[PDB]
Amino acid sequence: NKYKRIFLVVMDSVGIGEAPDAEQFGDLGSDTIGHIAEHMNGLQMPNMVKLGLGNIREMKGISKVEKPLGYYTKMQEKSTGKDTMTGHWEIMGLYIDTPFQVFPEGFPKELLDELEEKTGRKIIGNKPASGTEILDELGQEQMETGSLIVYTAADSVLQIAAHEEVVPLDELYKICKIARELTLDEKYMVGRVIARPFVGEPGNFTRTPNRHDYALKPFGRTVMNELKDSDYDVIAIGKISDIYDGEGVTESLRTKSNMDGMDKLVDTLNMDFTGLSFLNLVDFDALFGHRRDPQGYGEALQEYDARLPEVFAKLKEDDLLLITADHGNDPIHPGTDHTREYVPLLAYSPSMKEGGQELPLRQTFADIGATVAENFGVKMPEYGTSFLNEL
Numbered sequence: 459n460k461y462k463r464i465f466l467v468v469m470d471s472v473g474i475g476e477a478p479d480a481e482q483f484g485d486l487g488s489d490t491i492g493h494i495a496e497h498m499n500g501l502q503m504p505n506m507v508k509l510g511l512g513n514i515r516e517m518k519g520i521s522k523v524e525k526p527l528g529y530y531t532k533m534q535e536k537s538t539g540k541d542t543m544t545g546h547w548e549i550m551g552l553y554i555d556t557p558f559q560v561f562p563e564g565f566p567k568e569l570l571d572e573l574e575e576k577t578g579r580k581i582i583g584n585k586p587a588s589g590t591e592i593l594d595e596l597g598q599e600q601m602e603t604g605s606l607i608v609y610t611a612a613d614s615v616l617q618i619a620a621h622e623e624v625v626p627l628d629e630l631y632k633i634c635k636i637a638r639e640l641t642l643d644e645k646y647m648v649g650r651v652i653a654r655p656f657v658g659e660p661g662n663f664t665r666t667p668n669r670h671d672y673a674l675k676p677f678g679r680t681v682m683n684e685l686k687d688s689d690y691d692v693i694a695i696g697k698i699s700d701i702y703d704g705e706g707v708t709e710s711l712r713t714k715s716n717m718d719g720m721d722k723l724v725d726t727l728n729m730d731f732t733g734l735s736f737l738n739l740v741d742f743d744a745l746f747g748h749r750r751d752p753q754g755y756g757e758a759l760q761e762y763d764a765r766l767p768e769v770f771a772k773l774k775e776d777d778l779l780l781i782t783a784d785h786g787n788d789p790i791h792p793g794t795d796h797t798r799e800y801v802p803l804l805a806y807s808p809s810m811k812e813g814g815q816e817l818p819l820r821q822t823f824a825d826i827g828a829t830v831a832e833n834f835g836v837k838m839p840e841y842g843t844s845f846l847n848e849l
């Protein structure tokens with residue numbers, strides 16, 4: 459092995475400017491980091507700067523440096539979709555032709571009709587809403603009618619809420635599995651169906667810990683599958699395991715926040731493993747991108763950057779750190795959807811004694827997967843070109 463351990467960090471939605479095909483997606487003008495840097499009157503990310511973020515692209519407060527710690531470039535998405543599952547699946551060696559869909563005005567009548575026809579239950583709600591709003595609104599109606607509350611959100615999800623004392627948990631799960639089958643349909647293709655059981659009384663409804671998720675498996679066997687099958691460690695941190703529906707994962711560490719995510723990354727640096735440690739930092743997307751909150755997004759980026767020197771201190775000569783993103787989600791952009799953007803790539807190891815250089819632009823996210831596979835001597839993915847020997 460050239461590297462014993464690879465630490466891959468996805469800063470979820472942290473895009474570095476409109477992609478060549480951004481017009482197809484209604485994403486002309488998008489620029490996640492650049493618009494944030496503008497809003498902040500200069501982002502303070504000195505450690506990402508030291509790695510070479512500004513060498514990729516200069517932005518307010520993010521300048522190029524003469525001797526970046528590692529190698530740097532950006533990546534272009536080849537898959538059709540700009541959603542989380544597409545980006546992550548591509549990163550780990552796949553190509554996804556069929557995009558996952560999001561439903562801001564609610565789900566189509568035809569899908570809901572087929573769900574009614576299969577379940578014998580009425581559907582109410584059908585709108586993007588918080589777990590608090592639809593419950594407050596329609597929780598009482600649900601209790602009195604045995605109807606299902608269907609709701610969505612800014613991401614590719616279909617949520618089914620029902621009171622545990624009105625619809626038994628087992629029945630809610632059966633219903634969600636049916637919905638999961640019906641949404642394996644390109645017209646209605648959602649990343650995840652979510653059971654949202656709740657208890658309580660009107661004006662005091664609470665969601666229970668009995669949530670279950672029904673995800674689609676990646677459309678192909680990934681570099682993670684191949685690592686796991688060759689007896690390497692694949693440690694998933696945060697949403698990573700759910701994103702791949704557990705495929706190729708040997709250990710999964712739950713996280714509650716970006717800072718918690720960084721703590722778990724630090725924990726894996728303390729572990730004697732051989733293989734991949736894979737972190738998703740989701741707050742960027744979930745709390746700030748979709749809520750179009752450039753200030754919160756800016757602060758979160760600064761909070762993340764401040765954690766980095768501890769990571770640098772723990773990396774060994776035969777460790778590689780890879781930092782990237784899975785799409786954009788520009789918080790100064792119309793609507794609530796992701797943005798089709800290039801993503802940054804930084805590749806750093808303490809063994810890089812002379813610092814890094816510019817890498818050729820990565821023409822697919824799968825170049826990461828290809829690099830990982832070549833490093834560990836496993837079957838190369840069908841998609842992606844390794845940059846391992848460029849390092």
Ligand SMILES: [Mn+2]
Pocket residue numbers: 483484485486791792793795796797
């Ligand atoms: Mn757009």
Ligand SMILES: [Mn+2]
Pocket residue numbers: 470471541542545743784785
């Ligand atoms: Mn994402």
Ligand SMILES: [Mn+2]
Pocket residue numbers: 542612613743744748787796
């Ligand atoms: Mn998202």
Ligand SMILES: [Mn+2]
Pocket residue numbers: 640642643
């Ligand atoms: Mn169908």
Ligand SMILES: [Mn+2]
Pocket residue numbers: 721724725
């Ligand atoms: Mn610790």
